[PDB]
């Protein structure tokens, strides 16, 4: 149209790799362990 642009992906320079995310496994499973500690006291004698 008159005076409007539209921005799009033109090209990719280089190799093509995977977009991702990284968490530490030790810290995350320690966090899940502590959440399980706090969560067993609301559902006693059960495995979550």
């Amino acid at each position: 149209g008159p005076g409007q642009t539209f921005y799009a992906t033109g090209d990719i320079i280089g190799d093509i790799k995977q977009a991702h995310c990284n968490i530490s496994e030790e810290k995350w499973n320690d966090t899940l362990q502590k959440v399980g500690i706090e969560l067993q006291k609301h559902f006693p004698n059960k495995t979550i």
Partner: antibody, heavy 126, light 106 residues
């Protein structure tokens, strides 16, 4: 010990095409990039391009576009170097080099870690 | 850019420099150094800005100052008369070289 085997001499008239074959041994073809180095006699080396051996995506230099194609075969673990419309300045030594480690999470294609070099080939244009 | 040749007596260090633009060496520390004997493939002893692979002693040492990268050869011997090339990453997944330097060991 890993090793790279390159093709023999290629003597032909200008205007034709040259295929250079590079065969790897001692390591799997999927894990590493393959780069190409062209060295004119009495002149320094010149980078030519890289190929992702895991998928076949390749890139060339800024002034070799339209003349150069990269192919490979992972079954027999080799790469092919096709150059079209050669000129008299294309008489040079061609080297197949092993680059960085191919990883799916970060672009290590442009790393100039040329670990192992092949024996090279000579291309003479009459 | 690279000096054409350097000369030196045995038993003393020498330096070979490579000065490039900010996009070549200033932005990215990917610089490498190879030597090439005549009638032979180029060798492999510097890959990162300072690192060395296995099988290479402390004869060679790389460094980067600002916009240039210099390789220092601590001591000299008659084996070190090969032609030295520096190489770097120029951006946009494009790799460039230096051009060459001939070492004349006395």
């Amino acid at each position: 010990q890993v090793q790279l085997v390159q093709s023999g001499a290629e003597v032909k008239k200008p205007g034709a095409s040259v295929k250079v074959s590079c065969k790897a041994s001692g390591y799997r073809f999927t894990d590493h990039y393959i780069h190409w180095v062209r060295q004119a006699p009495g002149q320094g080396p010149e980078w030519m391009g890289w190929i992702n051996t895991s998928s076949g995506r390749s890139n060339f230099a800024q002034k070799f576009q339209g003349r150069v194609t990269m192919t490979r075969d992972t079954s027999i673990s080799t790469a092919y170097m096709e150059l079209n419309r050669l000129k008299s300045d294309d008489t040079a030594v061609y080297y197949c080099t092993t680059g960085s480690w191919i990883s799916l999470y970060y672009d290590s294609s442009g790393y100039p870690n040329f670990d192992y070099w092949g024996q090279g080939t000579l291309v003479t244009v009459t | 850019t690279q000096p054409a040749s350097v000369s030196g007596s045995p038993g003393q260090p020498i330096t070979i420099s490579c000065t490039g633009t900010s996009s070549d060496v200033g932005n990215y520390d990917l610089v490498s150094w190879y030597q090439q004997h005549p009638g032979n493939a180029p060798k492999y002893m510097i890959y990162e800005v300072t690192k060395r692979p296995a099988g290479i002693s402390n004869r060679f040492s790389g460094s980067k100052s600002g916009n240039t990268a210099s390789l220092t050869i601590s001591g000299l011997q008659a084996e070190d008369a090969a032609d030295y090339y520096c190489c770097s990453y120029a951006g946009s997944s494009t790799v460039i070289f230096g051009g060459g330097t001939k070492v004349t060991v006395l």
